[model samples]
Target chain A: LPDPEACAPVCAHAVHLISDLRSWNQRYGGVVSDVRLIGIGVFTAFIAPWLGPGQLVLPARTAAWCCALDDCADSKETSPEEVARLIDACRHVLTGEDPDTANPIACALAAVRADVAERRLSAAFAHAWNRSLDRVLSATLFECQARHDIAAGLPGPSIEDYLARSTGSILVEVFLLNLCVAEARQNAVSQLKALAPALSHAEYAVRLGNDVASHGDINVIMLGMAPEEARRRTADHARRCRDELRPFLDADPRGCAVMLDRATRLFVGI
Target chain B: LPDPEACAPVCAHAVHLISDLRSWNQRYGGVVSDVRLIGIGVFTAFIAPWLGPGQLVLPARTAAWCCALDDCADSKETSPEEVARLIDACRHVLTGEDPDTANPIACALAAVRADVAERRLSAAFAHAWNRSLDRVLSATLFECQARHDIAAGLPGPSIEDYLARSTGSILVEVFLLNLCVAEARQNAVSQLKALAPALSHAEYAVRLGNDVASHGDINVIMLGMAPEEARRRTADHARRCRDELRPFLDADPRGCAVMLDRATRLFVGI
Candidate 1:
């Protein structure tokens, strides 16, 4: 941006948008009034990329996005045009509108949402994995799960057609489990933010978010959501995710190195 | 009010933002890093207005503004023009040019910043607080102290006069402290924004700008600029400010509430 014109006063209109940020910060500050993340061991992961422990102060939301992987307000939430894009992707994947060898997950998810929109939500999850799994590399875990069932070292891929038909199903179970963990995490967030104003520690609210992020990561999906595994991994996943995302719970953004370190810890835990 | 023809597509766009939030949240949801607040809490707080907790799902930055309080971003942080407006407000207040009330903190802060620009920064603090304090009821404990001292038949108002000396002195202390906390916070945010390609949990960042809002609030004239009480009384000031501002904190036209709450807390430790 160009420097603001020097009008009545020299600083009357400073050019830097960042100066706006500087001014705002002096008055309001981050979620937790003045807490630093340097001493906190968990936040070390996200902070790893940028500054050291005593460097950055972050809001809990910034940390949450890093872990949760959501998008920006303008890019993701503000436009209907984007929904068309999602719908297009879903339609393309379900109908083979756009063929792609690289992004199976995208294809699968789009197909699932499209199916859900079509009122056959049951087939959406099971079929997405089944259709695309066969196309991906055999070594991929998602592919492996889709293939062999009753195994002698390696079993034949069961037709999802027959599998969804049975009362005791696998994919259905995973889908429900995935939804459940997500719902649970959302529950925790609701509990936390509602109380943040009353209790300014706000760290408590962030901690609750941490729990949700971790649960979503491991038992939720990090270990790979195979139906049985979804419910199967909830406990362990919650535990591991909690351990991983908890330290960065302070929500300071300046300590990118610390955050990176924590992000690395996920690899360590893995 | 009914929907507009153009709004049909616009509403569709709004749905897409919700959809993207839900979709990304379904899989990668959680506090991904340390700097961002999870979109979930933003979801909860934003939704709290509509969903009544059982089923509200807010989008990003909905709950937090750019200003400081609870995801509120500051206008200054969002745009330089906004900052300039505030700066102008203060300049006018100190120069006795604006017919409007110069009693507000934002005006006072601008006055101080302008003072800094003119190298009469300390005098600016003295003048801003001097002209502004008595007319406006502060959310500070100084009022309580004055009341109590009067109750006890004290000689002076419980509120101390320019406890610290020199605008340069006050700025030196505030600026250094702000640097420490802010750098730590900013550094942390910069790191986390990296993990999520798109999402930036900036509720805290919005507040970061608020910490500086009181740059003008530090009245070196009546309140004396002593750091001695800063350690103890500032802590008390935070508690007092939080209590006083609570009723109006979440209300709209939130510019003042958010700024006041954030600025007071950052300086006074509330």
Candidate 2:
């Protein structure tokens, strides 16, 4: 991997990014709480440790916004209809339409979109970014609806279904954001397509690990499995994903390794 | 709805569009067969009976390409990996990247992309189009992988799961293409977001109708249901979707009504 010490500078840079996120949060009436800002900053810095602070801004803001959206969708206080409306506002802002300034989530998303627009990405990357944004929103909506269905005693999502939607929740956005920051050119689209399987497996491993750590209706254990088995299965899946990604190390050693490392650490309770 | 006679002119115009698709198919070594062209043209015309000949061109070409891609993904002869590669090639072409000229599917997709690009779509519509394209490709890939898994004697998708992925197969592309052709300005993003539930339910209803009409491993019937029950369920679902969409008639009555009409017709064996 890259030097472990290299992340320190990125972490230092995230302090400023976190401040900007804080301002957005406050300006938008706390889309995410102040305490969540610290975790979002640290996670963003660790994920792309190689990027300097300037490069970290988009990812930091995006991560913080995503965290807020997730909470909003998952909160019992927010109805599924409200969550759908919030997502719709974000989607509109993302597609270059004006945001509903009264909506905190929309305003926060606009701020992230503005940061992305400033990058002047290549047409291919721009399209990729837009598609990732769409996926994140769409997946979040699906999950919110699924949770509502379960709460109503309707047929809920299968483990396969939950993981499939969860894969798009934040993983694709994070990966594309990393590529955007890296200024990946010449086969950027193909590279993403090629690494899709690895990315998906990585997401599954991480999500399964999360489910083991925190119980939920959608959790594997809740879906009719024991905790020990879920942990074992998650570890096996992580190893399989690592093996699948080994060849791509030459293509993006840092990304592939970091992703695998993160999944492993999460699974093992590091 | 518009005058039924109005569709006569659109049908006449589709002849030229069909010819264009035929030329592309031949040039690309028959991505879709000659016979398929007739059905593609008619379906395009019926879906957007209000469109003129000039406006029908993009939808005709797009529908043709989606048909060919679906066949490639569903074909028993094509492996899942090959389907993935074909989708990747199309994704690359859609994102303003170069096509691998040697690949016929890629070449055909480039032709479709070029037609879309010529319009100089607004940034918002362009992003919407790109995101819809991404969803189609991703959903197709997921279905392909699931089919492969079933063939390998693994657990196949449930009816709900199948319908979820099937929702993106071609419906969203067709709707967005209609919006693109109609020059839907001012709140196109919100319009799409608002219509999403209607679109999703529409897809489910149509897919279930098809499943009952034709049986397969992933079919509702094969998922452990009687054909008669499936048909009844499809009708019930279609009626529910129509009810949900009733309020949106003022937004884009033709689009909403046509979608509901088509789903109802399909379910009733019209």
Candidate 3:
């Protein structure tokens, strides 16, 4: 067909018909699988409600990243070396050693940081990440495999064609999102003098979740929830929100007063 | 032979016989020890307390040093580094260990600060100074010879003493100030968060006092006081008045609140 066409080009002007495959598809084909290209726009279209300066997405909204200089997560203290001299003095005082007449809180910050680096790592990492990889892989594979093939290797699956399926990123995402909130919350608490310790739970909660979701979007995640379940759980969390997250609300109602003060100082644009 | 030129052109001035040596002695000599020469007249005299500041003739009052950082010094993070990590999709959950979730109290501040460097010191000059030299000469003839004469004929008697007093410093200032506050009051039910742990009685007080003082002030090894005694004795330190040492009072009812706040900040600043 290559170029017998040169000679046959003369005769090739015989007949021609224009056909539109796209048109045929519109009339016949039902669906398409490759959606990455179109999905973003489609998803964005669905999420327009959350795009503007004022839109209601879910439970609450807050800054995605800490813009405050005093934010510990993002503080610019020049990698401020913690001074721990005061900490050592404090320990001395508590154990009935004479109160150190020297280093107090600020001085102790530096040395305490050093000592932590020196001592054995806290003995708690085992449970935190022990089976993370296995869990992630098991979960990912559980989702990717086809429903029919899910039991391809199951014990009685080949023989009876009986099968079971597992799915959902909810667990990991929930935990991770919770952690993000926790971390965000922590940055907030560390800015306070008295409220800091109490808010550490929020800090840790977010930290635990951070492991699973480094870049999380609360709106995105919330939207992913089953609308009914989300509504139920959110309402439940609300009615008993104070009780459910009592640990988080530890800063007391005065939190707003304290937090507002922090905001003013930071927003001073200094 | 004394020519007018040779006699010199310098005119001799006559003085009245009344020499007020007593006034000079009283003012310059005797009163010099405590004349309140904060001599900062140039700095403070014209400036209203509302306007600016003053120079200090004595050591400047400064804040205590601290080592508490990253929410430590109270209950240690089961794993601090881990806690800093991110969580997953859960906005409020922690991605890693949640030291904050466990809720360390103010003692955590003490705990975190425990490693603060205690008072550091230049190496001590192990030998006695002139006072001992004088004592030696007064006590023994061979001692007098020991000073200038290298001749040794069985040194009469051995001499020993420990007399290396501290030259007051900013560090010592922080210590004395905190020792005067109740912020450091650590008891079974009431302790500052972020304070380090007290292992034994000795360390307990060291740590307590550590909490009680500032960095570099920890050099006070006056550990002779038992833990219980130190606690019982200093428990009411705030009420005890060293009125003779008025400078130590940041806020007397007669003093300024700013001064009190400044003094308080100085203690925790460490």
Candidate 4:
């Protein structure tokens, strides 16, 4: 948990974002519990160090929107068709197309797009957005599959498999929070491309870190590995990721490398 | 099923490749059944017209090799560590590092690398090879996840998620089957890059068409949708793929577009 000063800014922004999304809350009143709001609050605080003070709201709000969408999808009240529709709407918002009315995810993402454009970093933001959207949608679909497969008596995922897919899906946008700000995104699109694998390494670390706290995270506990095995797997990846990023550390444009490293350690706390 | 006359050449060649892979087969004999040989035969026939007579054997053999590895990964006898090791070795081969000789996948893929080099189409083959290898490895990882998720009473996957991942993994090197032959791969690297998406669409169609016969294939049946619904989803993607390819049809280097189209229609049975 973060101290009071570290928590204050993100929490205030999150409250505003949640109130802004109150209509969406009313829309999902019965389907999702108040517990998710606390989750949003905690996540915003968790990501604040990387997001910094000025630009905290975008990621905070985006994280909240993502959790809300995730909650709606997981609830029994959400139909498959509706899940598919929400996915499409979110994709549209990312692509700068018109989103469906009354859709808060799209609304939140639209604001994100506008912020990126205002900073003249549309291309960089779009690339990250495209990559993250694909992962997010795929993760949702996999979750849907897991539920159906269990009901139908099909086999589930192994520890290794869960790690790979979850790593791919978990931190799609969080790592890019640095790029969401103007000062952090100094390089042309080409330089950003080179740093991508490094970002992926950091994201891998965050996913492993997430495994520890992700209660009811179907992929984590689903596999009956020994108690310490999960941590071993996580540390193995952490070591491997640092190895993965070694070649690109000095080559990265600006402080992107350290930014990613800082954000990763903040999430991993090791 | 394909006719005997259509299948003869590929099967004859497959027998030789099977012999070539005899050491690999020995390693995996405990896992893969003899039925996989005919699967190679069928795939060979399915891909014959696009590959033509002279170039048939290499891809037929390679396809057989891929399926054999896939079988090994899925078997209960195969340890998770071995699966991870095999995946790493294959990645090493793709990235131009040395492979584990004791590893059959590395042995086969190394041959593939040499063959591509002999044909002097290294750049074009490498691009497609990199994309396919990531997909193949990720697909293998997802399959592991699905099996475990089912056992632990978690969800499996949606039709959309399965299609996206399968499209990435399916037809690993088959579309490039034509290019593997000396005759068809005459382009500068630029042209092959241009047609990559067209090839991707064709691969998407192949995945959908395969879904039709993939009964009890965990990913397909795992979703629990109606039979026709899956087919409908598959066809919907097929149509979109055609739309995706429309611009590239005539623009592809040499025979690349026609090659991909023929491969798509063959699998789609259109």
> Pick by TM-score: which candidate is best?
2
Model 1 chain A weakest lDDT span, ten residues long: A1-10
- Give DockQ per model, in order: 0.03, 0.01, 0.00, 0.01
Report how far residue B219 has shifted in candidate 4, in Å: 2.1
Residue-wise C-alpha lDDT for candidate 3, range A156-240, written one tens digit per residue = 2221111111112212221222222222333322333333332222222222232223221222122233445433433332233
TM-score of every model versus the real structure: 0.23, 0.46, 0.20, 0.42
Worst 10 contiguous positions by lDDT, candidate 4 chain A: A1-10
Worst 10 residues of 3 chain A by lDDT: A10-19
Q: Candidates 1 and 3: which is better by lDDT?
A: 1
Which sections of candidate 2 miss by over 4 Å?
Answer: A1-7, A170-176, A183-187, A251-270, B1-270
Q: Between prediction 1 and prediction 4, which has the larger TM-score?
A: 4
Q: Which CAPRI level is candidate 1?
A: incorrect
User: lDDT per residue, candidate 4, A1-270, as tens digits?
Assistant: 112223233333433433433444465443234444433433343343334434554554455556666776786666667777888888777777877757665666676567556656656665765666567776776676566666668677666666666665565345355333433554534545665766666666666656655632465655575536666766666566667656666575334454454445545652
Indicate the residue-level lDDT of B164 in model 2: 78
- Candidate 2 per-residue lDDT, tens place, B1-270, comes to 112123224434444555566676777678885455654544454455455666666766676777677777778888888888888878788778888546677787787777777867677767777777777888888788887888899878876777778667745346454534464544556666766666666667667777776772356677677888877777776677667777775566566355444433433342
User: Where does model 4 exceed 4 Å of error?
Assistant: A1-270, B1-34, B45-54, B79-81, B177-181, B186-192, B246-254
Mark the 10 consecutive residues where model 1 chain B has the least summed lDDT. B64-73
List per-candidate RMSD values in Å.
22.3, 28.4, 35.4, 27.5
* Chain B TM-score (each prediction, in order): 0.23, 0.84, 0.20, 0.74
Q: In terms of lDDT, which candidate is strongest?
A: 2
Residue-wise lDDT of candidate 4 within B108-138, one digit each (tens)? 6776566656655656555765655567777
